[PDB]
Design a protein around this ligand. Structure first.
Ligand SMILES: [Fe+3]
Ligand SMILES: [Fe+3]
Ligand SMILES: [Fe+3]
Ligand SMILES: [Fe+3]
Lengths: 287, 288
């Protein structure tokens, strides 16, 4: 049985991603967010509700990525150096998830926080979208998986980390770009700096597996990938309407969702499927 | 579907373990090992071989703990705060495994290193030992597990974390306790500082599951636990004989194995099974 041997490379990229993930290590104690209360009170009830809801959704996605997506993909990888990188990424997803609780502690009472999480648990679109992604992960709960099964779990993972988080990240960035909740925005930027490299790395691994598939299996997962992209897109458009109609941002968020879907496709080595639009300039200022 | 909510505790210990694991964070670039060359060359050929073999075995165990043990135990936990801790622990196992490569780069040529890893891969006792532990983890590759299956995977994990590593950790500590390979010894001490808290934490989780089992299931896993302890003990005694006979340390290491088996049992809330024997005094100095 093999032990990981970093003195013989298993691929051309795991070491650089290992070093970059480590170099980016952080925890929430590093960013105090009490100073955000001054701008929090300037928001309306509807703005505060939208913010709390989106962060709740992000927390759910990170919970599933650290607790199901990274563990189950990594268990079935044969490359021990790449597996090492995924294990570190999974730990960072738990740091990300916990960092949302650090923000909530400053912005909400204990009762308001347990309302957020009750709303998350019972929410039908979050249940549907998380269920679609984790169905691919839960297919890996068996002793031997096919490469198609592993590939599709990697596709689901890239779509979560490069695409599905963005209908939520939009709002903290948009507010930070307007000088509101800027300490929380710094946390979100640290999360995004990690997520960006997560989706690239998993996308590299997915492209490697794809090239190992038979032609018949390639055709199958190519079609399933495009269907999944658009199945998730329909749900995201329903989610954005629900979260953002009250604050007049639906179409803006939808543009941002499309921009990030294209990035997720590119991370998989696939062509964009939505028209190229430039990033909202307020969001850009928040980045 | 539930998201982790750290503003409502799911238990009385996950937050403290989370904070401690994070406070202990380290990577292999923090400890330069070049200066160990001056004592490395003073070791005999037999001593150098034993060191390299033990570190190769340790690498294998961490490789399996980070890549199977932590992921498969955590995926089936219902407690999202405890799952978070296990995910961080699994990442640290990868740091541990990689740190052995950093030591090897100083102590061995490229060809000698690839020989270490070939000896690990084809080694029958390492294969048997790791296979026994990972069989409990691989049982969890299914959508629905029983609490007996999850409990026994946690037992296997504690036995890896608190017991099986010690036939290998003995020798780096023994040399460091004599002023030899002290930089590598510092790394091993950082690893042990993590491993100790890993085994304590998983042992707490195992005790919680155990209390939910029926009395019949409790007596079944108690029997499996005692048998597994001794199945691993027989293999460890063969392993210590193979590794340490050339350098006269077999009985010392066996005493250390028994001491750490007792620690593993106590991490699970169980009584010791080996007579109390104080730790080798030089090993204790390598831990100081
Ligand atoms: Fe994340
Ligand atoms: Fe991520
Ligand atoms: Fe370890
Ligand atoms: Fe450990």
């Amino acid at each position: 049985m093999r032990a990981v041997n970093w003195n013989k490379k298993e691929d051309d990229f795991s070491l650089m991603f290992w070093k970059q993930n480590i170099a980016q290590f952080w925890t929430e104690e590093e960013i105090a967010v009490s100073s955000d209360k001054n701008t929090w009170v300037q928001l309306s009830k509807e703005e505060q509700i939208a913010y709390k809801r989106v962060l709740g959704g992000l927390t759910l996605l990170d919970t599933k990525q650290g607790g199901e997506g990274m563990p189950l993909v990594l268990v079935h990888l044969e490359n021990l150096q790449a597996k090492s990188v995924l294990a570190f990424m999974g730990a960072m997803e738990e740091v990300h998830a916990k960092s949302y609780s650090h923000i909530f502690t400053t912005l909400a009472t204990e009762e308001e926080i347990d309302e957020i999480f009750d709303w998350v648990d019972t929410h039908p679109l979050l249940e549907k979208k998380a269920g679609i992604i984790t169905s691919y992960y839960r297919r890996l709960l068996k002793p031997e998986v096919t490469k198609k099964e592993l590939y599709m779990a990697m596709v689901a993972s890239v779509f979560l980390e490069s695409y599905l988080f963005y209908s939520g990240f939009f709002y903290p960035l948009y507010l930070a770009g307007q000088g509101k909740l800027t300490a929380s925005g710094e946390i979100i930027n640290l999360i995004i700096r990690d997520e960006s490299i997560h989706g690239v790395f998993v996308g590299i691994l997915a492209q490697q597996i794809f090239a190992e598939l038979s032609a018949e299996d390639q055709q199958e997962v190519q079609k399933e990938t495009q269907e999944l992209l658009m199945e998730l897109y329909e749900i995201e458009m329903a989610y954005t309407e629900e979260i953002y109609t009250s604050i007049g941002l639906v179409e803006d968020v939808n543009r941002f969702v499309r921009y990030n879907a294209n990035k997720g496709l590119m991370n998989l080595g696939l062509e964009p499927k939505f028209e190229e639009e430039e990033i909202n300039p307020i969001v850009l200022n928040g980045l």
